[model samples]
Target: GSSGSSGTTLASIGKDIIEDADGIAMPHQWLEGNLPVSAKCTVCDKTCGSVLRLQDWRCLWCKAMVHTSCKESLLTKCSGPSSG
Candidate 1:
């Protein structure tokens, strides 16, 4: 019988999950300058809306709000509107 080769196939390491400060993996797509009035920043729990216009980042998927400055420091995740 022939001996088996010692070479191993390379497997994908896998893609990186974008996790938030809350330690949950969130697919956050941030949009700016469109925050609704009285919107609060999820990161610092402060006002993000402005009188002139909207001034914050909002996720298109989960509709979560975060300050532009706090986007990187906050934790968030996208839970679907429908389904458990």
Candidate 2:
């Protein structure tokens, strides 16, 4: 499941996933390092599927899990003015 689909529990290490920086976790590239974890995406409310092998990223503010597929648009909201 390494190159195919995978999971990780280091929600601790991969905290700053979006600078809109690391870009997208294309193909199975997310499996390169320590790997991504399983958690329900707060954005889509979908559970991160290990069988589907989608990469999960945590939001620094709320510690919510979001899919890497959502990263591009996620940063768009972050790039916006104070939603505060």
Candidate 3:
């Protein structure tokens, strides 16, 4: 006999994790800020910066700059510390 332990409700959660080259789960803590010139998004593989204060996301761990929208897709694709 087992009780009901599958029912759970969550409104939100942190970004998903990725398996880095080190075989570690890399959950990027994306920071919101304005992008600089020639700043490219690793997720969409496109330029994500503007001359204005357009908000974007940057990961300090993976050193990835991405659009706020792309953050969803970029969650499990971090270029981990092994790239160096």
What is each predicted model's overall lDDT from 0 to 1? 0.74, 0.46, 0.73
Provide TM-scores for the models: 0.56, 0.34, 0.54
lDDT of 2 by residue, 22-78 (tens): 444322122311223555655667766444543456544344456677644454333
Candidate 3, residue 10: how far the Cα is off, in Å: 30
lDDT of 1 by residue, 13-43 (tens): 7788665566454467888778887788778
Error of 2 at 30 (Å): 12
Best by lDDT: 1
Query: Model 2 segments beyond 4 Å from truth?
Result: 1-38, 49-54, 75-84
**Highest-TM-score candidate:** 1
Can you give the lDDT of residue 40 in candidate 3?
Answer: 92
Model 3 Cα lDDT, one tens digit per residue, 1-84: 877656767698779755456566556767776567878988889977755676787877767888878888764656555555
Candidates 1 and 2 compared: the better one by TM-score is: 1
Candidate 3's C-alpha lDDT? 0.73
Task: Please give the ranking of all candidate structures by lDDT, highest first, separated by commas.
Answer: 1, 3, 2
Clashes found in each candidate (C-alpha, N, C closer than 3 A): 2, 1, 0
Question: Least accurate stretch of 10 residues (summed lDDT) in model 3?
Answer: 17-26
Error of 2 at 15 (Å): 26
Instruction: Return the TM-score for candidate 1, rounded to 2 decimals.
Output: 0.56
